[PDB]
């Protein structure tokens, strides 16, 4: 039915791993076929062998234009087609605002917010070319809703992410092409365990210490798994949600509401 | 699967006609056991006596904490159990904000944000009582995003609803109890064809001309069904939402961006 | 000074004590001629009589058309003149969500929802009548941004103020009137001294510890005053925000950013 | 008065025309004195002549953290002093989202995000050597609430400063320094006078159909004027201010309420 993605054609950037991974896995569930474009091509084959519908590894670094267009096309010949991208790629560092570097603010800038540009851009230009009514579902974050301390160029590049939704959302409209983002909370990845240890660090605490403290800041009570993000993901890929684009939707367990 | 509603058992208020019959029809194709609770219970029972999984109408007016309290046990009697309630039952008359009268300021406080508290304090007694993971969603408004001219007493009905949700959102999460809402847009039911000729004479247009605006002010390029509206209301209802509470999900074509 | 209240007539309504009382003199420390309406007027009375530039003590319930349509009328034609409201009076009851009565859900919703309200039509009457570029603050709350557990129903009786005061905004602004509102924080006046207290009992806290939790939630590092609402009102008031209206202003220390 | 600069040193980018130069006359004007850090220094000059209190002028690109840091020395060497930076400068570029240049990407970016985030990260290194309340007030734009069309790029760099605003806020509370933004509406400025041209050649409209249509979605019913935004500037820098921070004012006109 409604929620059904039988036959279509999907690209995830960032897919190798953690919340990428998950969606890869409920897309190909819901009944796509799935293409992961990552900067760790094997861990990619990894993934896609456990998938139903067969699918494809590329390498990409979503930093660099030239990349992303041979990744694409790469890609698109391989699916016989290209219906949806999901693009989730993205790193983060942890800094006093006083001490960030030039060097780690352009690293959370131009994977998380050129990356999602460019894979957007590239995206759109194929389906206007083939007629597709294609859908966008992009990763922003909880730091897209509210400026995190510690993280100040992280949010800023994170609030761009949304920016960029709501303002190609209104552009691709009128072309039936929907364009939406998940904003997560906590989730339990590589990328938490690096930053409850960089928060202990800077603040003096256990890294368990600091985890407990997100689980306490939930109202729903528990730590946020990549597949709670997933399910979302396949939502907003469906045409359960046709009437809905430049949305920025929470996924937090309650600490967040919009 | 984790979209079904397979075995769950649902109350919708106001699921006599428009957005309501939607839902609660489409609760149904998801797997559902669904009450119908509203004032017009001959048109109920024609509702439900379309669906598959069965169902039963009951008399309610939500305006009045005795007929809520009758009906939902009856309901949940019925039923057999309690798992959702779909709080849908709403009101509108449009007015200048000078002219308002007591008498309609209290019509719609009353159907609008009285009812979604007496329907939702009611079942969460209930779902507290069964140490049921029970669910609840809203019905608000893009009016409880943004206050709308000529409707400034329907606005600010609508807000209270969402207010409400997040507030008890926050009550509910530690007890495994999830509550959100929706915020349509533009929806085609007898609410509209009702608002559309008055809105026409007191703006001083044609009937045609005011249903004109309305689609070139929606990107995505339609009038919305009511159908756009109760996919989405499936989606918070079931087990994919499972991380999210206290949201007010906007369905309006691209017409508001949270 | 484009910040000068000198020779400009306004109302208070709950300006006895509190909020409304730093917000009288705040304005007649601008330059205004302040009447209050309070239902206390003994206390408006000792107010009014250490102001700068004269004024005029009312009683009025605001819960109630003709006690508002008569007090108005009377600090107008007391006043000589009309060109500033600031809707004040509010009230608060803590109970979980589960537990509220439709006793207290009617004694927030008429003060705090119908007593703006009926103030702000009243107001926008008299100024259209005598086409005065009028100006109206209302004073909403924090809990009008996020939904607060044990303030479920005063949440959405705010929630209500800052629906009304858009749509309210968006019909006057035509009509050279502006309609804006502030969202306070913690702020310590006797309505903070009760709900430390009834929040102490419903938590198991002390009510110091409740306290110190409000200052710790808030990143500026101290409880808040009602002279740190009262000056923001003034600004409000003032030419300086001549492009301003239809907002809900965050006075709040940082605890909430819009 | 509440609202008095006097005594207080002030440094505003972007401060030789349009905004920035409003900005720097009503600073000057409710007490303050001004140096003006921009690209075309000899304007800045033209501006200072006409202060009241003197003032300064010194070239800066904002785009280069060498310049920056050498451009603020030289002004806090010239003031004595330093407790206020507005960080104004600002541009823009006009595109269909799929035709967007890398070039007009780093463009924007590189001036309204780098450029605050450099004038902002050294502002607070100089006012905690110095153990000085700073205040900041940051230029957004109407874009960084909404997502533009044929700004998207623009609109994702703007976000960027809200979500820095709000980030950088939250470190800065507890060492006594606040640090807001200011959103425009559609300001009449050399700025408007170049995107009413490009937009109206990509619309296929007269450049007066695109300025009556801004006119037409502003509730106030015209067209703003720099001095609209500098006098809420004034009133985020002075201590009526004091219990605000992290914000992002809307000056609009009604355009959007927050
Ligand atoms: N974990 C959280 O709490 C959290 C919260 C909110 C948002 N997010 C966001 O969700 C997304 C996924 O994060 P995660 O926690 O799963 O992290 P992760 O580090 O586990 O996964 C990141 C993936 O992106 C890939 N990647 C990184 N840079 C790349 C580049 N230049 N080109 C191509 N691929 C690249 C990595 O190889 C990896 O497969 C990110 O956009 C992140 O900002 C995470
Ligand atoms: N249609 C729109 O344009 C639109 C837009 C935004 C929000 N909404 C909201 O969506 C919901 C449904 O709207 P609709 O257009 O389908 O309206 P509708 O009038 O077609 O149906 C409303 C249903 O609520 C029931 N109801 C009314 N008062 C009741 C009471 N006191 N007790 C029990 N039942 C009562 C009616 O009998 C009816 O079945 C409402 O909450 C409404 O405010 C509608
Ligand atoms: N104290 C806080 O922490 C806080 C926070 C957010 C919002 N607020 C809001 O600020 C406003 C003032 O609160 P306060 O703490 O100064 O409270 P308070 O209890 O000290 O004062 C309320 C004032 O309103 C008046 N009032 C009450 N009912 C009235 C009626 N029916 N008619 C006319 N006057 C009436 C009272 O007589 C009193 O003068 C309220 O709207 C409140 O909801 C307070
Ligand atoms: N005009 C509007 O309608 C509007 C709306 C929203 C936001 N804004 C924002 O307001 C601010 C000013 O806009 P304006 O309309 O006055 O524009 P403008 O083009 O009139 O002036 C911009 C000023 O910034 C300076 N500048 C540009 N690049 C610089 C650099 N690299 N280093 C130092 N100085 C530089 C210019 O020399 C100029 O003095 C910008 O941040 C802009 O994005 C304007």
Redesign the interface.
Same mark, same amino acid.
């Given at each position: 039915?409604?929620?059904d993605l039988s036959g279509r054609k999907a690209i995830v950037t960032g897919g190798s791993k953690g919340i990428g991974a998950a969606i890869a896995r409920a897309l190909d569930k819901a009944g796509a076929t799935v293409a992961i474009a990552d900067l760790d091509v094997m861990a990619a084959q990894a993934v896609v062998a456990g998938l139903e519908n067969g699918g494809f590894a590329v390498e990409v670094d979503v930093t660099k234009?030239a990349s992303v267009d041979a990744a694409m096309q790469k890609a698109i010949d391989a699916l016989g087609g290209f219906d949806l991208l999901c693009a989730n790629a993205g790193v983060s560092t942890m800094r006093? =605002?006083?001490d960030?570097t /030039?060097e780690e603010?352009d690293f959370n800038?131009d994977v998380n +917010?050129?990356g999602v540009?460019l894979a957007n851009?590239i995206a759109?230009?194929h389906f206007?070319a083939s007629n597709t009514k294609g859908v966008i579902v992009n990763t922003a974050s909880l730091?897209?809703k509210?400026?995190?301390?510690?993280?100040?160029?992280y949010?800023?590049?994170?609030?761009?992410?949304?920016?960029?939704?709501?303002?190609?959302?209104?552009?691709? =409209?009128?072309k039936?092409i929907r364009v939406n983002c998940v904003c997560p909370?906590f989730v339990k990845t590589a990328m938490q365990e690096r930053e409850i240890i960089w928060e202990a660090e800077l603040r003096g605490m256990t890294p368990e210490a600091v985890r407990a403290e997100y689980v306490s800041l939930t109202?729903?009570?528990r730590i946020?798994?990549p597949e /709670?993000?997933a399910?979302?993901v396949?939502?907003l890929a469906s /045409? =359960? +949600?046709?009437?809905?684009?430049?949305?920025?939707?929470?996924?937090?367990?309650?600490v967040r509401? /919009?």
């Open positions: 039915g409604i929620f234009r006093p =605002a006083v960030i /030039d603010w800038f +917010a050129r540009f851009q759109c230009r206007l730091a897209a509210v400026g995190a301390p510690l993280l100040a160029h949010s800023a590049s994170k609030f761009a992410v949304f920016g960029w939704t709501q303002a190609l959302a209104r552009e691709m =409209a009128p039936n909370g109202p729903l009570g946020e798994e /709670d993000v399910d979302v396949v939502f /045409d =359960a +949600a046709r009437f809905m684009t430049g949305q920025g939707i929470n996924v937090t367990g309650g509401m /919009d």
